[PDB]
Structures are given as C-alpha cells and as structure tokens.
DNA sequence: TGCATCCGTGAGTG
DNA sequence: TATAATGGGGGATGCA
RNA sequence: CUCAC
C-alpha cells in the first residue's frame, strides 16, 4: 500500500500508535502529546521514539499536485557558478603541482585523496616510495609549507572558501 | 481539395509540428506506424530540436556569407599563386 | 515594414499569421466567428 | 537609429545577409584583439569614460563602421574556411 | 488644455429635439392605444425614431462645438485624434442614447440624461446590462481569437 | 550532424536492447538508509550511479575507474547524469496491448 | 493506466483524492504537455521584469533600465570588466563583492556603464500579439525601480501606464546582438508589417500639442 | 466495461 | 470642521449590519448560546437528526454542546492554529433485542468558530467563507430548444442530495422521463404509485392528446409490485430484481430523506408553483406498505396544461432572483458536517456488526476521523474558503459581502456562458450591477447591495416603503424578487410633501421594466438610491456622472488601498464612510457612557457610568494577510467624558471615524512634457516631504531547524568561514536583534547543517590541508534576506521543542520567525488611483520649483493628464475636483449623496463663496491684478469663457466658477497659455508597488525534470519566453537570438555552463548543444514504446545521448 | 447519433 | 492455522 | 484570487 515499503511488524507498530492516540483523543477532549502517547504505550516508549516513529511513518506526496514540483529546485546538478569555481579551484591548484615537484605533489594526492578518493595514511603511502612514516611526513610538510609561502604572494586561494 | 487550417496543420508532412499542435496521440501513433521521418524543414521542428531555424540569419541563402578585408583577402591570394 | 522588396529569409508565414491574429485578439478586448468559420 | 542603416540595407540583397556579415566581422575583430581592423585611429569608434576617450569595446559597432567604409568584401564562395582562419590568425596573433 | 464640467457644452437644440421626439412618440402611442398599429410596428418605429434623434443631437453637439467653441478641449481632442470619438463626446454632452436589454433587444425608453447632467438610478441600472454583456463578450471571445491565432501560426509556420 | 528525426515502433527486443536490467520489485528506496532498493524502481545497478564516479558501497570512488562495474554491489562508476538516460524494463508474463493502437 | 490514464473507463487515483495520476500521455500532450510547455517555449536566464513608465527624454532607440536590474542581467560581463580594471582581484571575489548590498562600491556602477556600451536589450510585453511585441532598445541606466519606455512605441506594445509591466532579455552573442540591433531595433521598425502603414506615429499629447 | 461487475 | 451635506431624500431605515450575512448564518447554524432544549431543527441539529439514529444494535442521538476555545483568537493567529471549539454529543446505545442501555458523551473533534467581524482563523491565517449563489431547488418548466411547441419539466433538489429529473415529452404523445442519463416512459413509474387508469382520467382529463395519450395498456396490466420490478430491471442491468432490493434502491434514491433532499426553500417553491402542499423534502414516500406520491402528479398536471392555453402556467426564468438562492456560510458548513457525519455512520455500521454484539459502548463504537477530516477539508481546501483580503478595513467587508457562482456544487469556468453572467432585472436592489471583477470572472463573482439581506430560504430581500393611496408610510416591506414582481414601485426621489407623493406623474417600475405612472397607481417606493448598489460603489461621489465601466474599476480599486500613515477622509463624501468604519470593526468605540480613565499608545482605560473600569488593548502594528500593517491609534485624552457609541480609537486607514483610504491632494488637470503620457501621473516632491503617501509594510521570514539522519540543525551564532561584519546585528543565540537595519544578503537567523557524503572531495581536501584550516562538518544554511527585500526588525518569535506549551511537527526541532517591517514612501513606479477609475504609475517626481503653482505661490501636488478623461467618460472626478477646489478655501468637507448629491448651481454658489477668499484677500493686501493674468484673461476671453468688457475680478470669478484658475509654470514663471482646472481630489495609493515587482536573474534554481529555470520572484525564477515570444523572434528572423533563448539561457546544461564560463572570462559564447528537455522528450517517448531516432543525412543514427544510453 | 478533443499570453500571492 | 461466514457502493466539430 | 491586454 505504501510507496515507501515498510516491514510488516513496523506497520503493525504504527497502527498501534494510531489506535492508541485515537483512544487518548477520544477520552481527553483534545489531541494527545508525544508524552501522553508514550505513557499509554507502555514501557520502553518515550516521546522521542514516538516522534521518530511518526517521522518514518510519513507518506510521500506527489509532485504533480495542483504544479507542486515546479517550486522545487534541483540541488544535485552543479550550477554555472558552482561549475565555474570548481573549475577555477582545480586550475589555481595544479598551479601548485608545478611549483612543488612530481613526487611532492603526489604524497599530497594520496594523503588528501586526489587519486583514489580515499585518504591513504603515511603508512600505506610508504609502500609507494619506499620511505617510512617520517620521511613521508617531512615530504608532506615540505609541500604544504612551501605552498603556504606560494600563498600571500599570489594570494589566489584565500576567497576560495 | 479544400482543407481547414487545423486539419491542414495536422496533415502536414512533419510529424513534430503536427504533434506539437493538436491530437498528439493520434499523430504520434500513425507517425510511428509508417516509420515517418521528419526532414526538419519548417520552424517549429528546429525549435523543438533547439537548432537554428531556416529563416532570417538561419536561412541557407545568407548562412554562409563570408567577410574578409582586402588586406588579408590579398594576403592569402599570394601564397595561392605559385607552389 | 520597410516599403521595399522583401529580404530573402523573411519568415512570411509567421508574419501573416500574426498579422491576421493581432487585430482579432485586440478587436475583442458576427465578426470573429465568421472569420474562424472561413 | 543606427548610423547609415539605409546605406547598409542598400549594400545587401537581404538584410539578414547584412546581419550575418556584421556578426561574423564582429567575432573576427573580437578574437584577434581588434588588430585586424581596417579603420584608422581617427575613424576608430570611441567611448567616453571617466578617464577619457577610449576605443569602443562593442565590436558590432566596429563591424558596422568598417562595413560603412567599404573596406570589406562580402559574398559566397570567396575563400575556404580553414585557409582564412589560419592566415588571419597568422597575420594577427591571439 | 484642461477638463471642466463646463467644457461639456450642452447644445441648445437638445431641448427642441427631445420635445419633437416626445410628440412623435405620443403620435405612435396614439397609433397604438387606438389600435392603428400593432406592437411590432410600434416598438420598431420607436427604436428608429430615437436612433434618428440621437444622430440629430450628435450633429448638434459637434456643430455647436465647431461654430462657437473651436478651441474647446473636448472638440480639440476629438477632432485632432488625441482622444475620444463622436459617440463618446455625444454621451458626454448630448444624451447617453438607447440601451441594451440582457437578451439583446433594445429598451424603448432611452437615457435622456448625459454625464454632465447626471443620470437617474434607473437609467444607470439599465445601462449596466449592456456594460455587463460587453465585458462578458470580450472575456469569452478573447480565447477563441488566440486559439485562431495559434491555428494560423501552426498552418503557416513553414 | 543531425538533419533527420525518425520515429518508429519499438519491438520487445528493441525495448530490452534499450534496457539495463529488469525491474522485479515495486520497491523504491530504503525506508531507513534512504538509498535505493536492490532490483527496485531506483536501483543503481540498473539505472546508474547516484554520485559522480562513485559506486554504492563506496569501493571504487573516483575517475580512475570508469566503466568498471563494482563486484560487491554491482554499480558502474560513470557520470551520475546517466540516471536521466539509461532505460529500464519490465518483462510481463502474458503480453498486453498498447492502449494507443487499440483505442 | 501507465500509458494513458483515464483513456478507457475510469482514471486511477491515489487514495484520498479524486485526482487522476499523471500518465505518460498526460505528460506529453495538452497545453501543459511537454511540447507546448518545454519545447516551444522555455523559461530563460538573463531576463528580468518590472513595472514600466513613460520616458519622454529617451530617443527612439532607447529605454530606461534600472541599475539594480542591469546589475544582475549583466553580471557575468561585469565580473569580467571588474577584473580588466582592478575593482576586484578576480571573478570569484568580484561576485562575492556584489552579494551583499552594502558591499557595493561606486566604481562598480561605472564599470557597468563601460560594459553595456553599444549592446542592446529586448523589451517584451504580454500578450505578444505580433512581431513588434518584442523590440530592441539601447539601455540607459536610471535610478529607482521602474523601466522607462519610449512614448512612440507604446502603440505597438499596446502599453499604457496604468500598472503595466515588461520583461527584459539580453542577447549574449555577437550574433544575437547584431540581429537585435539591425532587425529588432525600434527605430528600424517604423512601419507596420501587416499593412505597411506607420506604427510609430504621434499620438495623444504629441498630437494635442502640434 | 466494469471489472467489478464482470468479475461478480 | 464644517461638514456640509446635500440631498433632500429622507432615508428611513439605516444600513443593516453589513457583516450579518455571515454572522446571522453561522450563529444560526451552531446555536451555541441557545439551550439544547429550545433549538430548532436547523443547521447542526438537522444534521444530527438526519444521520441518526443508526440502524444495524441501535445507536441513538440525544443532544450536543459546544465548549470554549482552548486558545484565543490572537493566540491562534500567533501559533499557526485553528480558532475552534471542542464539540461533544450525548449518544445512547440501545439493544433492540435485549434493551441494553449504555450512554456516553463522545468527543467528535473541534469546530472552527467565526470571529466578531465574520471571518475565520484556520492554521494561523485569517480566511473568509464566501456565500454561494446557485439555482434554487424546486420544479421548473423550460421550453425544449429542439422542439418549439413542447416543454421540458425539471425537478431540481439540493446539490448532492438527489438527481435531476426531466419530463421531456418525446415525439409520441406520451411523456417520458430521464434520470441518471437513462430514459424511460413515465407510465411505468406512474403505475408504481398506485395510479389506476381511472385516476388519470378523473384527476387530469382535459386533453385527449396528452391525458389519454399517456395511457398505454401494455403497462397498466400489472400490479404496483410487478411494475416496480420492471422499472428496477430498466434502471440497473445486472442486479437481480429482488423485491427487497428494488424497493431499497428506489426509496433510497427518491423517497428517502437521507440521500434525496429537496430544499425547504425548494419545498415552498414547489408548493407555490404547483399550487399544492408538501409533507416533506422528498418526491415520494413509503407509507402503509406501499409507495405514495406527492410531486410527480401535480408536476405532470402543470406540465400538460403548459402545452395548452391555460392561465397560471408560465415558463420560469432560471436567472431570476426568485428562482436563484444564496447558500450562506452556515448552510455551506452544514453540507460538510452532514457528509462527515454520514461517513462516521458508516464506521459505526461496520463496527456494530463485528466485535461484540452486547459488549459495546458509544465511545469505542464511534470514530470521528471522517468528520474531523470533513470539516478540516471544508476549511482548508474548499474553493469558497479564501485567503482573507484584509488590506484595508473596506476590503475585508467587501470580501465577506461578495457572492460567488463557482465552487463545488456550482458552475465551472467552462460551464459559465453569457446568461448567468448578465445583470438580471431582478438584481435591482439585491446584487450590485457595478461590483464585479474584470476578466474571466465577470458576472460570476458579485457583491450584495447595501440595503439587501438574505432571508431564511436563501433568497435576497430588498426594502420598499409602502404607499397607500398617496401617503408614503414609514413602513418598510422587504420583498423577494417574485414578491417584488407583484406591485408598482416608484423611485425614491419622486417629489414628496411631508409623506405625500407630490409628483403629478412618477417614474415607477413594474416587474423591473420602467413605466411612467400616476401617484394613485403607486403601491410602493424605493427606500433610497443607495439600495441598488454595493458598498464600494456607494463610496463613489458623483456616481451619476461616472461611466459604469470605470465605476466598476473605482470600486475594485478602493479595495486595494494601502493604509496610509497620514490617511484622511475625502473632502467629498457620500455618507457611508462612517458606517463602513463602524461595521469593519477596525475602529474602537464606547459600549456605555462614562469617562476615560487613562490613554496610552498600548491601551485605553475607561471608567464607565456603571463604575466598572474597562481596559481596551490597542492592536499595535499587526501584520495583516497582505502585509499592510493594521494599527489602531487612540483619539481621546485623559479625563474626556464619553457617551455611548462615541469613538475611542482609529483603525488603519481611518480618520476620526471616517474611511481614510487615500489622501486629499491639490491636483491640476493638464498635460506635462510627456510625463503624463497615457494615464501616467506626475507628483510633487512636497508629497514625500510631509510624508503623504507613505505606509508601513510588514513581512515575516520563517525558518525551521529539524532532525536529520546526518545530524541536528542548530540555531547558532557560529557560522563557518564568516566574519563579525556579517554577524553584527545578531544576538548570542544567532537571531537578529530587535531594532536593526537589514539589507539583501544579511543574516536574519543563523543555521548550520551537516553535509552528507559531500565530505570534501580531495580537490577540497587538498585545499583545506593547504590553507591550514581544516574542513568543518557543518555548513552555512542561514536565513538571509531576499534581493529587493528589507527593513527594520520589530519582532522575533522563537518556538522550540522541549519548551513548555509548544510541540512542533514530527522531525522539526525549532521554528523561528523574524518580523521585518518597513516604511515605504511613494516613489517612481507606485500605482495611484481615485474612486472614479482614473489610475496610473508615478512617472516623474519633480521638485517644488518645477511644479505649476497658483499666483499666490501655492504649488499643486498631482498633475493628471486630461486625455484620460474623455474616452473613459468618468466626469465624476471633475465634479469632485471643482467642489474640492471650493473645499480647499472654505476649509470645508462635503457629503454628496449617491444620485441625490450636489448639483451644479450649488457647487457654483460654494465656488462663488470661495473666490472671495481666494481673491478678495489680495486686493486689500496691497495687490491688484498681475500682468500675465491679463494675458490668460485675454486668451480665455477668446476661448469664450469670460465676458468681454468686464473687470479682471469679475472675469477671474467667471473662471473660478468654471473651476479654472491661472497657473504659473515654475520652470519659466510665464503663465500657462490658458486657465487650468485645479482642485482637491481624493487619491489613494494602491497595493501594487515597484519594490515588490522589480525582479532580475542572471542564473539560479532550475526545475528537476526539465532543467529549466523556475517561475516566480520568490524562487528567483526566470521569465517565461512562451510560444508567442518565439513567434516574435521567428517573425523578426533573429535565429541566433532564438537559439540562445532555447538553449544557453535555458536548459542546455553543457552550453549554459560553458556560456557563463565564457562570459566571465571575456570570450564569445560557445555553439549551443541539444536541449536536455528534448532528451527528456525522447526518453518519455521510449517509455511509450516508440523508437525516436535522430538520424543524419544518410539515415544513420546519431547519438545525442553521447554513449550514455547505449550498452 | 456516440465518442473524443479542443477551447489566448505573461506575471503576483498564500 | 479449524464455531460459521460464499455476488460492491457548455459547445461545437470531426469522424464511424 | 489579483495585475496587464
Ligand atoms: N493562483 C491562485 N492564487 C490564489 N488563489 C487561487 C489561485 N488559483 C486559484 N485560486 C483559488 O481557487 C479558486 C478558483 O480556482 P480554480 O479551480 O478556478 O483554479 P484551478 O482550476 O486550480 O486552476 P488550474 O487548473 O490552472 O490549477 C479561486 O477563486 C481562488 O479562490
Ligand atoms: Mg495597461
Ligand atoms: Zn561498489
């Protein structure tokens, strides 16, 4: 019945919430709070869990509701402004693959994850140049500290926030 | 045979124009059945395709008109004299 | 629009359509029904 | 209106060809840094900034002026594309 | 150039025309009560008479304007083509004219007053029918017209 | 250059030729992780990657892998734009009639 | 119900509503269809809209474009011109300068003037009944919020001043600019394409005076 | 034409 | 000050409570103040008595009650709740077998209450339930459009309470019948009622073409049972004609007072039309084992005698106001209370037959969900439930007095033709002939007349004084339309001496149509000229000189008047501007006599005669629905003796108890260098200086912080990568301080949200590890200020979860509302309008030294072009301008009644009394006549305005009596070559301003599927370049501009990103690629099993998807 | 005579 | 997983 | 529902 399929037992729980809250409303003369529900449910039930259960019990709505999907932006795809700066960040950065070197501007690539997407520790990285976890460190900090001096003279990367 | 403007617009050779007009289903079915190809001749076709319309600056009559200064026009005619 | 021989590439059909349509829509805001009937 | 637009309409057999010529010449001037201009310093269109008279950034206006001078050749099948591109980029670097 | 209520000059021929109209109306009513004419002939003749009178008072307005007040703002704007037309000016100075019944037929009782003189609630209410019908006419025809436009564009775009 | 646009009838074989995998479950996305379901209406194994050059389980995570379908989850690592492109399909039991050509 | 919902018998609706679900037919066909809504007419960037107003001091090929609108509509050009001079380090900083209203200096409004020199804009009023429903105009930067429109063109657009509004559009290319300046310029389109008679003619005040 | 009545 | 009023007509009865159409309706529906023992069977009571008792166990209804609202009105507006009262009902369970009796008071939910002004408060927003006009129930007889000599009889019940029955006589002599799109001879149905052939010749029996033409032997040869069975087989193909099914269906569709319900009004209507009586709101009944008839036979009798030549038989006009009725708020609320009750009864029936047929209680047997959902649906989604128009006090009043023909149960947009839109002759004094929207809604949405009221049957009543013989009585007789059509009704202005008709001949009306009649043949008379118009229409002075097409505009444009901070009553009034302020409940008055104890800007304390000390809180700067600040200001000083019904406070757009929509200004009617071209308006800068046309506008900026599967959103003052310069006006929590200047781009409320798997890609990881500062886990999602918005923060509302009294929606932690008010001065673009239709945009703002001024240095304020006058035919504004000119020097304000107002010679007299003050002061001041005034006098003498051979004083008097004066152009000093009309005019600033409507967009949000820019200023959307604009660019031949408009500036993602990147670097734009929405089209066609192929010239497929859709 | 299909544009607000 | 329960709740035009 | 036509 649901667009978002829910495990049967969970559905049963939600139904229990519905009937309980309905009873509470019928007897109080008003709608119940999370606390009254949590109390009437029994042990192990607090307001938080009731609220969360009600949060996952939400039915998604249609886009073509008189449309509703026309007032909804596309957060995924990069805009021209986004695509621009990202294409200006890489540009103003491979200006640093230069000033450094070939192996310097690569320990940083593994460490920061430019190549594989994941950050390789100075441990794993040692098995690609032979060096141990303290020539790598000096290999890294020589890069950054040099790049830090390459800053404040080109002063390009500041605003890039 | 005299035909109304609507019927004549739907009976056109282009299935894109006919579909974009009215009776989209009735047009698309009979178009897909006959394996119809749209030559992209009219305006609405090239509009849907997002191409340059075959009218005005997009007319083939004036599309490929070239502009060259006499200085360069002569500067190229020298190398194209001998070998 | 320029009182001279038409420039090649002129979208004649669109101009005609708008030239017939414009008065009708404006002279609304046994006339138009007859026009449509024709 | 546009300066001497009647003359330009007299130059062509269709106004759209004129438009194409103007646009293409504008792109030509824009890509070569105006160096390929057939205008003399006194004929060069100018804008009045807070500093003073500087050359007009609008390459379209430039194209129309140059077209008014009569120092431009128009028509179809005059010169192959790649040849014109190569030679012009040679004479006026980018 | 300005607009005052005294710029809506009521021609002096109006009273005479209304009198003659009333006496002819009386003559046709004599031709009705006595059974000399039917109810069709009566209504038609009344309509014709009042339209004719309307024309008369229009010509009177424009003539008096031309001869006695050639620089009158209304006459100026009307003649020059700046704003206004003979009918509207006639409504402003002469009479409002005959009005429309909601069905489409015409009230045999015209609106003798003008905007300068001021109408009665009855005349106003009578005019409201025609005004309403006009607005509805516009609103209902616009769609048809635009539709036609799109048809033409579609049939001639190539 | 494009100068023609042809419309034609799609055979079941053509439909399967477009497709990248049969949709078997009427399930949309995970009701907890908010990720798509396996063989569902939003499965990435069929339609394509959700993020640019990244699989589901996060194994192959960048452009060094492209076209390489993961083994653990089974998702290709191309541009995430492909989910606006790659067609799916549903293999019916008893064939049905296209309502257009009928009515 | 998937291909053409509501075609045969009754249309399938979601529980709790009498609303037929949008099938693949309802998406493509209709005035709200994909064709008439997204192929034969789209929404565009580099386009603004404002209440118009009469600008008698304007020449036939001119219009009064507010500096606020012109700022946004010519933003990418301006970000370049602010780098070619020195009002900003680069383009990103230049854009992050115009973000907050307080951070806008005075040299910006001059650089913007330096940008739009020669290039024109396109004024459009709905309903665009004919070709002259959209016309090209050389923009003149003004204060306030309203767009100043030439009097003589108020007949083609059918634009009075009882609360009307117009939309602006910016030809980007050196081709789109030439098309507008040569073919779409109001001073070039004096006569009517329908009858041949002058459409840009003295009316109202202009007549009343003479 | 009605699946319900037809099935009934 | 001196207030001079005209008019000779003595209006007897005053205007009825203008909001009573909803008050008296809803209050009659609920009857909460009436003890349940003395309640009539109307409204909620009738709903309970129609739904109950429940047949299976038998659940029976006893009584109901309404409690007090859990939250007050202002608190409901505050916390986004509904102003409602808890409903309880006493139900008893009766076991029809045993006799078991269990009784309990069940809670059915809440019912939204109507406030004092006749509005509602649903989910924190004010709303109005507009009354609905519809074709009244009963029996009608319309001529068959296909057959001229024949007539169709129609039986109409209340909407969704029965089907429509047609009795079209088919071409065969015998009458047929049409129900539920089916058709069958009426004979068979006639047999079921127990009608023998003799009863059809005895009761009827007159025309052998109809009476004996109905009789067919092949139907008479069967018992009522057999005939009933046959008809059941005729109506439902597939259902076995069982005797207990046919009776159930037929009864349940015609004779059952549950599914079929004729109107009470409809009852009386049918009773009067057929000349009979009806035992109940139904066509037939089940009595004594068989069926007994009530309606069908007299209906047939009337129908057959209509085809003949019988007196008393006429065709009914369906647009008649005697055959059309008004369903008010109470009835509309009832029809959604009955449905929600019938669904509750279903939940009861489906629970009485399973569970425990002895161990049940009215408590656990009743589920009120469908009822709550029903009422909530009617108040939160109905077409007649509208967002309240409380721009100014008048707007809400009009909104509540409007009448819609649309909505569920009425007409659709395509169902509305010409006839329903027209102004019927019976609209006289009931429905305003003037007040109606211009456009597609004309004739559908209307308004109620001033003296008009709706009776118990839903019909509109209009008052008429009785005239017996010749004496006009003070007895006022409210009549309906059909009641009006009986007598001859003279006009209200007809000459009267005391209480006697003095006119030798009077102008009267017989059935709407006008007729000149003698004073003896006069039975009734109009009570006032104001009775035939709306409220806004009655606020237009000199309306008898205004054209309807512009008067309509006048009325609709008053509604849009923004409450000015220096608002003032017009110098020319009609009289209603006081009552309107009264009934709108914007101003504050005294309940009893006494003395004011204290006066403050926040409160007013009064010591009454009763000795009781009452404190009246003043509503200070409250934001209405449309943004116009509704603020009350005190008008009394400490210790002021006050009588009953006296003013205590002035609401927004209200001055001393008078309606102050706009302001009185010095206007000169003349052209001005083109800045007056086409309705445009030129204003003096002296209007902005003394704050004329300046108003306060408030805008709320709500924000939510919720719990995510990534982490909680925190309202903080800590925002990553920011500066103190941007966080200056924020408090310690992160909310903007109260009383700060906010501009576009400024942070109103700080907020941080955790990023997902967007944990910086190595391009950003490396940058972070380069700049030294590490990447945070929270990102800036702070509520900023939209471009073009701003003002001063006056209020902050912070609601949280875990704080006493407030529980938010599931998932949401905390909600913050920033109230930002602004003081808007008049500027270039704002729309001004008078009460006569004249409107325009402020085109030019001139300094005072350029303004055409009077010779005594006094400059004008507004310059209105005369060209906007002749074609618009609205001379009322001119007549307002002259008397206004007189009122500017005499220091007077006037009350000129509608159609019985200030005539020309009286204005001449007043102007003559004004000229002596305007001119006479200068002659004893050591000043004669100016030199240029003589030139103006020369030209004017040539204009035929003044008399040749007269002193300049006399001639200038002749000009001043014509409303014209000498005007000096400030730019030169030289006079205008002629006399200009200058006076005082009531001009209002309208809701349409440029600060709102000015919008621009370089780039921004795109739609999901289409990838095309959004639509709207709020979403920073682009302008739609529709089909017609494309037709324009095509007609021009602008190919590349069109291609730009179709690609780079729209959905060509590659092309658009490349374009922006091309412009920001100073390059020429790239060649556009194929649109994304076209690919969307292709895939949407493939999903329809259609192979769309983009081929080249060799018919070989070209991939526009670029190897992304192919395996 | 039944069914299916059309019925103007752009923009604002909740 | 086992009392028994068995059939629902406008408006005009083109085309077959 | 409102603005413009
Ligand atoms: N844009 C709107 N803004 C405010 N109220 C609206 C709007 N559209 C409709 N309404 C309300 O709905 C009532 C009428 O709506 P109607 O049903 O005619 O529109 P609709 O059918 O929803 O339009 P569409 O089908 O284009 O969405 C109006 O009288 C008004 O109360
Ligand atoms: Mg306008
Ligand atoms: Zn993986």
Automatic annotation (TrEMBL), chain A:
<feature type="binding site">
    <location>
        <position position="38"/>
    </location>
    <ligand>
        <name>Mg(2+) 4</name>
    </ligand>
</feature>
<feature type="binding site">
    <location>
        <position position="156"/>
    </location>
    <ligand>
        <name>Mg(2+) 11</name>
    </ligand>
</feature>
<feature type="binding site">
    <location>
        <position position="45"/>
    </location>
    <ligand>
        <name>Mg(2+) 4</name>
    </ligand>
</feature>
<comment type="similarity">
    <text>Belongs to the sigma-70 factor family. RpoD/SigA subfamily.</text>
</comment>
<feature type="binding site">
    <location>
        <position position="42"/>
    </location>
    <ligand>
        <name>Mg(2+) 7</name>
    </ligand>
</feature>
<comment type="function">
    <text>Sigma factors are initiation factors that promote the attachment of RNA polymerase to specific initiation sites and are then released. This sigma factor is the primary sigma factor during exponential growth.</text>
</comment>
<feature type="binding site">
    <location>
        <position position="45"/>
    </location>
    <ligand>
        <name>Mg(2+) 5</name>
    </ligand>
</feature>
<feature type="binding site">
    <location>
        <position position="42"/>
    </location>
    <ligand>
        <name>Mg(2+) 3</name>
    </ligand>
</feature>
<feature type="binding site">
    <location>
        <position position="45"/>
    </location>
    <ligand>
        <name>Mg(2+) 8</name>
    </ligand>
</feature>
<feature type="DNA-binding region" description="H-T-H motif">
    <location>
        <begin position="122"/>
        <end position="141"/>
    </location>
</feature>
<feature type="binding site">
    <location>
        <position position="42"/>
    </location>
    <ligand>
        <name>Mg(2+) 4</name>
    </ligand>
</feature>
<feature type="binding site">
    <location>
        <position position="45"/>
    </location>
    <ligand>
        <name>Mg(2+) 7</name>
    </ligand>
</feature>
<feature type="binding site">
    <location>
        <position position="38"/>
    </location>
    <ligand>
        <name>Mg(2+) 3</name>
    </ligand>
</feature>
<protein>
    <recommendedName>
        <fullName>RNA polymerase sigma factor SigA</fullName>
    </recommendedName>
</protein>
<feature type="domain" description="RNA polymerase sigma-70">
    <location>
        <begin position="121"/>
        <end position="147"/>
    </location>
</feature>
<feature type="binding site">
    <location>
        <position position="42"/>
    </location>
    <ligand>
        <name>Mg(2+) 6</name>
    </ligand>
</feature>
<feature type="binding site">
    <location>
        <position position="159"/>
    </location>
    <ligand>
        <name>Mg(2+) 11</name>
    </ligand>
</feature>
<comment type="subunit">
    <text>Interacts transiently with the RNA polymerase catalytic core.</text>
</comment>
<feature type="binding site">
    <location>
        <position position="38"/>
    </location>
    <ligand>
        <name>Mg(2+) 5</name>
    </ligand>
</feature>
